[PDB]
Amino acid sequence: WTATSGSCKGRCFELQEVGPPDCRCDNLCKSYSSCCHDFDELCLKTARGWECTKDRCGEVRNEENACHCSEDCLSRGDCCTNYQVVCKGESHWVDDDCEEIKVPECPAGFVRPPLIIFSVDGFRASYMKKGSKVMPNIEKLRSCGTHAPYMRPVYPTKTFPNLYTLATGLYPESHGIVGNSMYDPVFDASFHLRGREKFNHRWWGGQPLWITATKQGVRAGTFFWSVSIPHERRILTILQWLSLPDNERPSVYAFYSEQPDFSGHKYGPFGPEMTNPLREIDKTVGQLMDGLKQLRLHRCVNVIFVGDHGMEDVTCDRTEFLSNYLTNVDDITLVPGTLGRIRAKSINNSKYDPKTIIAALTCKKPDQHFKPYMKQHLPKRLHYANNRRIEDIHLLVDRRWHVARKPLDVYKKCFFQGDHGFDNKVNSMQTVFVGYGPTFKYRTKVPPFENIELYNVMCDLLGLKPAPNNGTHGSLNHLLRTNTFRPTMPDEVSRPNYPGIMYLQSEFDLGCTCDDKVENKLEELNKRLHTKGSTKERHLLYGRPAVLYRTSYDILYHTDFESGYSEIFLMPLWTSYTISKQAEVSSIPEHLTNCVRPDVRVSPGFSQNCLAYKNDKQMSYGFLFPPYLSSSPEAKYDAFLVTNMVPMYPAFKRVWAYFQRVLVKKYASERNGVNVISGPIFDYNYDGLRDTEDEIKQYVEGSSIPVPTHYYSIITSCLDFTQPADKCDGPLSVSSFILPHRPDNDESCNSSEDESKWVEELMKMHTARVRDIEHLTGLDFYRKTSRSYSEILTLKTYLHTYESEI
């Protein structure tokens, strides 16, 4: 109930919402059915349209009009946006040459440049190029301001997860909006697009920008707009708010457009019906910029033009049905569409088995257009697991497709031609970013970046301290003329030990053997030097990673590689080595096939042992520096040290061996040398963060040797590939991965074939940012380069996607 018999007189679009049952006059009252009886009459005036016409100029104020062309309108702050063009012979903003904005040019009393976020739903990245002829205002923003070719949304590439990621800098798993549709089993409650439950504040975690601003004394316009408020009215309202007195006027504002998404669903991303919606959005941008010019704010305000995701071609005939796989279809609940999430229909059903559901969905059809996963086995880059609202079972659906439970769900719900929600690396899901204003750079292109980064920058733009978030503060400094945030490197928490030869062979009882008893003064001084770090400048190009937590570990030097060896986890945290373009691959000589050698620098007590691997029928082992890439037959002995050993399922050894034997050489050829850092990852609670030792759920049988959930590598070379990796004078280039350490290759439907047919495809799928690996290992890379730190932070957030060109 609402006592809707009060009035909006003087209160239209009130900035502070009023407490029930007193009727509301804010831009959200419609959505709560709680507007005052006179809201439409007073606040949603439409009379005479939205533009001044020649004859309306210098008219007598008629308050009934939607906007005004009277002489007093400018000081009243309610002229139509084209008033000055028609009545004062001004030019439209789009027709003015653009001119660098070196400093904010603001009216007196403005304490900071305002921020206006112009958000456009379903605005696919390629619209910028493909729609450029019909979007002149947006094209001027783009070419005159700072722009990226595209911006990467978060997974799932749905509306609410992305808008709320924009507002908070958080992954959906952390902010809690993990889909447009959700079930929370602790609340026992459901969230949907239609309905009231989504208004309950308990769904929305973290700290969105409007709250960050408020708490720090910066006033905010309301970010949300009800559908029925026409775009023109949203603009005039923002402009009116900008005419408020200094003490009342907000500093941050948001406009939202339901277009082009709405049309894209109906007609497909490039349907001929899409030209119109794009024209119309441009015209809105035009009204804002004209309105700002009129208020002398066009060289004062920072404007962000930002999308939430793109749009793909998807039709009803491209639907996979779980009824063609599951005979038990009615005992599951499916969240359907461009992604799948599955749980049991009834928790009172003890015959529900996720394991057999997954198996019934694995590689069952030649061209199956979705892949089942347990959520902790999803590519780590999606960061889509650590929330009770995310179901254990997930389907990653191919672009262009849908998953549904039964055929009856589709024909009794072809309507749609476009949808979104797919993997956030998919080109068609990419969206847009432009920044224009005094704080952004002039005529600057920046590389693609992730929308999780924007919260930090919007905080910088407003002089706010951002709440803890998933952006990497400083990684977008190159977007800004000033207001930069100057981060410092995190302090190393643990310093390494540097052990010498401290143990005799006979102290080791590890059940290991090596045919290495096949034994000069010149070449023993030399090999001693190698063990003291003589070649370290070659294999450790960017300094040693810093350990950001409390632990006990050793630096181990070798001819061909350096490692940071954990006495706690009994294996390296990182292994670093450089492979020049000239490097030669060799094989493991027959006599050394099963060779594992004790490391006389490291006690038996802090070593792995071969016996445990012998007893563990499931677990085999591999090496982090690959024997195949040894620089000489004598250096190869080093690669068989028990301290270079890591536990690997035989299924994963196929992947790992192919990476080390074939792919590292290939990358070295193609990139003119590569530096590789590889290591283990333990994330048993799938929170994206390094596990402590008490979180490890699996060990090599009968031992304290913990099993990794993942193995990473970070592969660095020179951006200018005419320079070798080990002599690079400028910017770097990186690709990385976080491969899941799995006892089977079920994820790859082709795995029965040769590794050349499936391994690289699996690796690409599990591409990663260095930053993802930092979270997962507690390490900090690239400590010692000649590059600025901000550039290094950008590099650490880079993701190699393996998609073709936009």
Ligand SMILES: *[C@@H]1O[C@H](CO)[C@@H](O[C@@H]2O[C@H](CO)[C@@H](O[C@@H]3O[C@H](CO[C@H]4O[C@H](CO)[C@@H](O)[C@H](O[C@H]5O[C@H](CO)[C@@H](O)[C@H](O)[C@@H]5O[C@H]5O[C@H](CO)[C@@H](O)[C@H](O)[C@@H]5O)[C@@H]4O)[C@@H](O)[C@H](O[C@H]4O[C@H](CO)[C@@H](O)[C@H](O)[C@@H]4O[C@H]4O[C@H](CO)[C@@H](O)[C@H](O)[C@@H]4O)[C@@H]3O)[C@H](O)[C@H]2NC(C)=O)[C@H](O)[C@H]1NC(C)=O
């Ligand atoms: C992306 O960025 C984010 C933000 O920086 C990172 O997430 C943070 O990670 C922190 C470390 O894991 C985590 O810190 C913990 O906070 C606990 C209290 O947190 C509450 O208060 C904060 C501040 O206001 C609030 O933000 C939190 O909000 C969460 O929960 C609410 C309500 O449920 C949700 O609405 C909201 O969406 C959010 O949910 C998300 O996070 C929670 C975890 O908090 C997940 O479970 C959800 O799935 C979801 O993802 C909270 O309201 C605090 O209790 C923890 O302290 C424990 O551990 C420390 C170790 O330092 C120890 O000192 C204590 O003893 C304590 O242990 C006790 O509790 C244990 C568990 O109950 C128990 O086992 C023990 O026996 C002890 O009794 C901890 O400090 C922080 O909350 C989140 N913040 C957010 C916003 O998510 C994220 O890691 C980044 N991601 C990546 C990949 O880098």
Ligand SMILES: O=C(c1ccc2[nH]nnc2c1)N1C[C@H]2CN(C(=O)c3cc(OCC(F)(F)F)c4ccccc4n3)C[C@@H]2C1
């Ligand atoms: O009808 C839809 C819809 C649209 C596209 C779809 N595709 N498939 N199904 C769909 C259903 N709606 C109603 C829209 C109104 N709205 C906001 O007003 C908003 C603005 C924000 O910000 C706008 C800003 F980014 F500019 F700030 C937010 C920010 C954080 C959280 C929520 C926000 N909500 C978002 C809602 C999605």
Ligand SMILES: [Ca+2]
């Ligand atoms: Ca959307």
Ligand SMILES: [Ca+2]
């Ligand atoms: Ca973890």
Ligand SMILES: [Cl-]
């Ligand atoms: Cl969803």
Ligand SMILES: [K+]
């Ligand atoms: K074994």
Ligand code: NA
């Ligand atoms: Na397989």
Ligand SMILES: [Zn+2]
């Ligand atoms: Zn949509």
